């Protein structure tokens, strides 16, 4: 309910969610695929926290909650289907396109050129492209709880 509280959550996500780009390479994973669409949910919720971060007090822009609520939920819907697409994959082994990027700094944060659901074996402790459902539940569940 203060600059610190908001900045912690904005930091924790910018940090926790940016780490996403780390290890990607040695993992022998690389392809975000649908994930780029989902990466968006991070700046959606982080956007709100970092924009509302101005101070969760004097500034009435509290709207930060709804946009935080929206992006946290929007993240769950897109991540959930992604989880389902593994514990339940579809008949279209083929990939989409067979039936707003670019930016002065670097396109890196987003990418899709590589391949489809193929070898992907992860083997890292307990996967990770699905742990994200719980993590977004946390932001959403923090968000619902503060505005109930």
């Amino acid at each position, epitope marked *: 309910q203060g600059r610190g509280a908001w900045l912690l959550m904005a930091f924790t996500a910018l940090a926790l969610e940016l780490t996403a780009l780390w290890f990607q390479h040695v993992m022998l994973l690389k392809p975000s695929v649908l994930c780029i669409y989902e990466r968006v949910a991070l700046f959606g919720v982080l956007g709100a926290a970092l924009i509302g971060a101005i101070a969760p007090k004097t500034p009435l822009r509290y709207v930060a909650m709804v946009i935080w609520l929206y992006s946290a939920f929007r993240g769950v819907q897109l991540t959930y289907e992604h989880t389902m697409l*593994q*514990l*339940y*994959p579809s*008949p*279209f*082994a*083929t990939c989409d396109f067979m*039936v707003l990027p670019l930016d002065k700094w670097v396109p890196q944060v987003f990418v899709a050129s590589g391949d489809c659901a193929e*070898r*992907q*074996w992860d083997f890292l402790g307990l996967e990770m492209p699905q742990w994200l459902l719980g993590i977004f539940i946390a932001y959403l569940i923090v968000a619902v709880l503060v505005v109930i």
Partner: antibody
Amino acid sequence: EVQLVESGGGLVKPGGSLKLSCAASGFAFSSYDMSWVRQTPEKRLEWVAYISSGGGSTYYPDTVKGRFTISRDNAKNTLYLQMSSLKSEDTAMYYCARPDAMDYWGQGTSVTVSS
Amino acid sequence: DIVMSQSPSSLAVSAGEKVTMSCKSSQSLLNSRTRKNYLAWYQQKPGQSPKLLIYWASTRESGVPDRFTGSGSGTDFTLTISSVQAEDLAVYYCKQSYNLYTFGGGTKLEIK
């Protein structure tokens, strides 16, 4: 408990057209996906179309892709198959199925193509 | 596409026996992630819509008597019906759902 009754189709001429509707009744319609299976006169079984839960994506075998159109309307709980440029190959019985693996099948509308 | 092909066309059996017809697919049906064999068996009674019988390859469906069993893995599936009741007159169809939907030709289990 859960029902499907497709209907609305008999004879149609080559190059012809005709639209069938599966009247769905007794399950959370807008939540499942829907499919359209036909069965040839040889008793053969071809899958024909697939629409996603929220009408979003559709899919077809190349053998009807272009000529066939799997719409739905969860307002009036109906599934639809809109057949166009009708080949006399299309001549078959037409089941409307439910997946989660077709677990509740209809009963068929026979459709024949002839002159 | 994938081609499903069952043998034989027909089976006779005296009411109460074990029968194991076979479904073979042109393409392996295994995922790397989970042994998940993406084949189904549908039974279809004379002049009836097919009924779901076994999915994934092993797992039976709500109200399937234990007697129908699904073995198989890779390109090689087998359906097995012990204690053939009279109300088991049918053609048994295998379907792949690994890449689009294809069906076998069918196996007619006619009674003695």
